[PDB]
Amino acid sequence: MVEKGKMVKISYDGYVDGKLFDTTNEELAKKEGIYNPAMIYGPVAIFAGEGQVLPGLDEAILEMDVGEEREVVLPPEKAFGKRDPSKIKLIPLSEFTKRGIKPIKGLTITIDGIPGKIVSINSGRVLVDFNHELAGKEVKYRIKIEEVVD
Amino acid sequence: MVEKGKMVKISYDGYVDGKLFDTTNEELAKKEGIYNPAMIYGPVAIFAGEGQVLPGLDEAILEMDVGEEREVVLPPEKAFGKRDPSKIKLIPLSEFTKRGIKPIKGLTITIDGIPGKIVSINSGRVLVDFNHELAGKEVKYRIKIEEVVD
């Protein structure tokens, strides 16, 4: 099939929790009500088997042909990862104050270059989940290799 | 010593051929003409050994303690990778015309978010090198572990 390092152009949908969270189809982007005006639509180029896409997308692409389309189910391990409890940290309120941040339950904040979701605040102790937003989530893609190019 | 998955805050300065190309130090970036107003400066949080920094940087970090600062020279294979002959692709000039790009020898173009440097344009096809700009390059870092979160 398509082997590691081959520059292919790919089309992909991709759903999480029923709703669609990512696509190269702009017509479907409007219809689902997710269309971001600052998004590069149509097929995009990648080097197959090189971490440029989710691991499970890389695998499917390696066992596909030029012009082929597949629907693929990605378990968390193959998508954005499993949720890791060690990425839930308890941070002193003062650390937020000095940075001009007012932490609020359910707020997503950037701390030291990194996004976190605020879980709770108790007694000057802020619990932050730094796991990826979609970690622990099954994603579903439809992927199509439009062309190969070497 | 730092354990894998451990959340650490780091600061660093990257040099190639004696020139600064990356830094968490805003002042130094401005002094050295590489300041990027879209970049977030100051210490940056990462998870040790989880591949969020260069392989050789991850290794140093695992070998280090909090508050510790060191200088390391990384071979291409522990930094941005060796030059990859398979990443030099012969792309048809028709693909440039339709995009409205004039290929110029030495110019850096983007195809689908992937940068490439134009090497030559012969027989109706453009040779493009899609290697990282610093592939094959030995790099020096100054790295400090500023703190451990936990």
β strands within chain B, DSSP E: 7-16, 19-23, 44-47, 69-74, 88-92, 108-111, 114-122, 125-129, 139-148
B5 neighbourhood in chain A, CB within 8 Å: 84, 86
User: Which sign does the torsion angle of CA A55, B14, B82, A148 carry?
Assistant: positive
**Which of A9, A44, A86 is closest, CB to CB, to B5?**
A86
The verdict on A132 touching B (C-beta cutoff 8 Å) is no
What CA–CA distance (Å, rounded) separates B131 from B28? 27
Buried/exposed code over B112-149 (b: 16+ C-beta within 10 A; e: otherwise): eebebbbbebeeebbbbbbbbebbebebbbbbbbbeeb
Q: Which three-class secondary structure state does DSSP give residue B59?
A: helix
What CA–CA distance (Å, rounded) separates B2 from B92? 49
The 8-class DSSP code of residue B86 comes to G
Smallest CA–CA distance, residue B46 to chain A, in Å, is 8
CB of B68 within 8 A of CB of B10?
Answer: no
Smallest CA–CA distance, residue A150 to chain B, in Å, is 5
Q: How many domains does chain B have?
A: 1
The verdict on B89 touching A (C-beta cutoff 8 Å) is yes
Phi-psi region of A42 (alpha: psi -120 to 50; beta: other; left: phi over 0): left
B126 neighbourhood in chain A, CB within 8 Å: none
**Which of A45, A112, A150 is closest, CB to CB, to B45?**
A112
* Technique used: X-ray
What CA–CA distance (Å, rounded) separates A58 from A62? 6
CB of B78 within 8 A of CB of B54?
Answer: yes
Q: State which residues form the domain around B47.
A: 1-150
Residue with the two structure tokens 């979160």:
B149
CATH of the domain at A49: 3.10.50.40
B109 neighbourhood in chain A, CB within 8 Å: none
The verdict on A9 touching B (C-beta cutoff 8 Å) is yes
